[PDB]
Structure 1
């Protein structure tokens, strides 16, 4: 996409969970299940505001635990998240360090979703004792996502991806150039 960001409606991803998504990089939180996506897919950088991932909805499916490779299952449920947040390259090399010159992370995944724990998404997705997974994702209509958006936290906040057709397309728009 514009800026060199790698924004695909389906593919393979790794998955983790995080706490505290009430002031996220898109500038609006949401009451449903939400996630941060790695910088190369988010479409912005820290401090530059919302990228084109903001507001888009994705079905996520985990099917492998790289830290317990002999674990055969069960895995969690497939969940639908709305992307509200950025998992930046800085401080997240293992999972979110994809760049244009090296577009996969340390688990070989070209995308990463950090699922917010606060609103319940991670409890549906991660079995107890298995907090990092790999698997797949697919962008879906936000008709498949339960919840409501919060109010804007600053000027320029955006979740307009929530009404956009799947990538390739433009809603909030990308900011700057993807990390190299």
Structure 2
């Protein structure tokens, strides 16, 4: 995509959970299940505001625990998340360090979703005692997402991906250049 970001409607991903998503990088939070996505797919860098992932909705499915390779299941439910936040290259190397020159992380996955614990999404997705998974995602209509958007935290906030057709397409738009 513009800026060299890697933005595809379906693919393989790793998954973790995090706390505190009330002031996210897209500049609006949301009351439903939300996630952060790795910088190379988010479409922006820290401090530059919303990128084109902002507001898009994705169905997530986990099917392996790389830290418990003997574990056969069961895994959690498929959930639909809205992306509101950025998982930056500098902040999390193991999971979100994909760059244009090295587009997979330490688990071989080209994408990563960090699922926000606050609003309930991680409790549906991760079985107890398994806080990191790999699996797949697919972009879906936000008709499949439940919740409502919060108010803008600053000018330029954007979740307009929530009404956009699936990638490839442009809604909030990418900022700057993807990490090399």
TM-score (normalised: structure 2) = 1.00
Whole-angstrom distance in 2 between the partners of 1:139 and 1:50: 18
Shift of 1:9: 0.2
Deviations 1:121-166 (A, max 9, x none): 0000000000000000000000000000000000000000000000
Task: Describe the SS at the equivalent of 2:76.
Answer: coil
Whole-angstrom distance in 1 between the partners of 2:119 and 2:165: 25
Task: Describe the SS at the equivalent of 2:95.
Answer: helix
Structure 1 outlier segments of 4+, above 4 Å = none
Whole-angstrom distance in 2 between the partners of 1:7 and 1:105: 16
Shift of 1:108: 0.2
Shift of 1:90: 0.6
Task: Describe the SS at the equivalent of 1:98.
Answer: coil
Shift of 1:61: 0.0
Matching residue of 2:106: 106
Task: Describe the SS at the equivalent of 2:53.
Answer: coil
Deviations 1:43-63 (A, max 9, x none): 000000000000000000000
Aligned residues: CA RMSD: 0.2
Deviations 1:5-31 (A, max 9, x none): 000000000000000000000000000
Shift of 1:91: 2.2
Deviations 1:50-102 (A, max 9, x none): 00000000000000000000000000000000000000001200000000000
Shift of 1:41: 0.1
Task: Describe the SS at the equivalent of 1:178.
Answer: coil
Task: Describe the SS at the equivalent of 1:7.
Answer: coil
Gaps of 5+ in 1: none
Matching residue of 1:27: 27
Q: How many residues align?
A: 180
Whole-angstrom distance in 2 between the partners of 1:93 and 1:18: 15
Task: Describe the SS at the equivalent of 2:55.
Answer: coil
Task: Describe the SS at the equivalent of 2:37.
Answer: strand
Gaps of 5+ in 2: none
Matching residue of 1:137: 137
TM-score (normalised: structure 1) = 1.00
Whole-angstrom distance in 2 between the partners of 1:57 and 1:37: 11
Task: Describe the SS at the equivalent of 1:136.
Answer: strand
